[PDB]
């Protein structure tokens, strides 16, 4: 009577340990994935190395665990802007290469999407693709040629 009760206690304890072994190993396989991707490189995946745009992370040793210090990039202060998909010209439509067309009310500018840094819309940072009767929402503005004042000299 004592053998059957005591062996069932061990059979319950070993089975419960094997359940918790798979839970810990799943976190251990996750923690090996985190150090390979967040510490040993920059991860393109969203919300895998913290909340925000991931820059780097630092490991910290813990008793039966690991602590990750995820350094993230979080935008702070935005404001109003007016945008257009493209800008028409003398029979040409200009699209930004790696930027976005924005306006502050009077003048149009081109800047990156993650930070405000406006520039003059020139032919270096824009490429011509077709005319301006197909793109919906295209506006009218000039494009400054950085070679035209050198021709007039």
């Amino acid at each position: 009577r004592l053998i059957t009760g005591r062996l069932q206690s061990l059979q319950t304890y070993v089975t419960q340990q094997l359940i918790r072994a798979a839970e810990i190993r799943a976190s251990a396989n996750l923690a090996a994935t985190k150090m390979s991707e967040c510490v040993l490189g920059q991860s393109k995946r969203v919300d895998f190395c913290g909340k925000g745009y991931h820059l780097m992370s630092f490991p910290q040793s813990a008793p039966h665990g690991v602590v990750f210090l995820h350094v993230t990039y979080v935008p702070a202060q935005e404001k109003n802007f007016t945008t257009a998909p493209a800008i028409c010209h003398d029979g040409k439509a200009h699209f930004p290469r790696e930027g976005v067309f924005v306006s502050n009310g009077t003048h149009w500018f081109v800047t990156q999407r993650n930070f405000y840094e406006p520039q003059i819309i020139t032919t270096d940072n824009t490429f011509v693709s077709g005319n301006c009767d197909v793109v919906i929402g295209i506006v009218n503005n000039t494009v400054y040629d950085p070679l035209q004042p050198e021709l007039d000299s």
Partner: protein, 218 residues
């Protein structure tokens, strides 16, 4: 909170500033190695019971085999996590990282245990009928030396030590390549190098205060 962001077909929102945020993520690695013997747990010192235990066969041959497979993989779970690097990298004594301060995460040589100040309070907040506890394969000092090797390989080299040989690069310059991976040009870091380093130092020091603020974080 109810939010109704203004949407229009010709309106966009662009951030004119940013904030460097440091978040803490905690993941368990290994359990405690525990082995139970049926010879002593079920009936110790009695020779009339071990004859009765042989009638059941090999219930406890596979029972200790299952606990041995758990304990041999607890030491294995540390290997793919903390021993990702094969070499040990050392931080140079000249702490010139372009204003970036890593004193909370670098180990302190004054203490008998070479651990970081963040690792110091992490360990402080965490506490025989055939029952034994096997010691782990790697000691707590060896895991901390694994952490210091990966920390020195990230400040000095970055991601180059994980994809081949370690290539040296200043921290004020490799941080721009982390900015290029999220769509930010190199000029934003160099125009605000004092502001970013001040934001990184304040966010690192807030981790030590937030960890000791409540015991529910661990």
């Amino acid at each position: 909170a109810e939010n109704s962001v203004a949407y229009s077909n010709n309106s966009i929102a662009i951030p004119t500033n940013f904030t460097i945020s440091v978040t803490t993520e905690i993941l368990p690695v290994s359990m405690t190695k525990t082995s139970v013997d049926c010879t002593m747990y079920i009936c110790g010192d009695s020779t009339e019971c071990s004859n009765l235990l042989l009638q059941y066969g090999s219930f406890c041959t596979q029972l200790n085999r299952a606990l041995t497979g758990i304990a041999v993989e607890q030491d294995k779970n540390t290997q793919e996590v903390f021993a990702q690097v094969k070499q040990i990298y050392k931080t140079p004594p000249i702490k010139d990282f372009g204003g970036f301060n890593f004193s909370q995460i670098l180990p302190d040589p004054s203490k008998p245990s070479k651990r970081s100040p963040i690792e110091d309070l992490l360990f402080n907040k965490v506490t025989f009928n055939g029952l034994t506890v096997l010691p782990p394969l790697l000691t707590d000092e060896m895991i901390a030396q694994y952490t210091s090797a990966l920390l020195a390989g990230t400040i000095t080299s970055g991601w180059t030590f994980g994809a081949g040989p370690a290539l040296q690069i200043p921290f004020p310059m490799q941080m721009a390549y982390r900015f290029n991976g999220i769509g930010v040009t190199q000029n934003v870091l160099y125009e605000n190098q004092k502001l970013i380093a001040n934001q990184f130092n304040s966010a690192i020091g807030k981790i030590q205060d937030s960890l000791s603020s409540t015991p529910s974080a661990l």
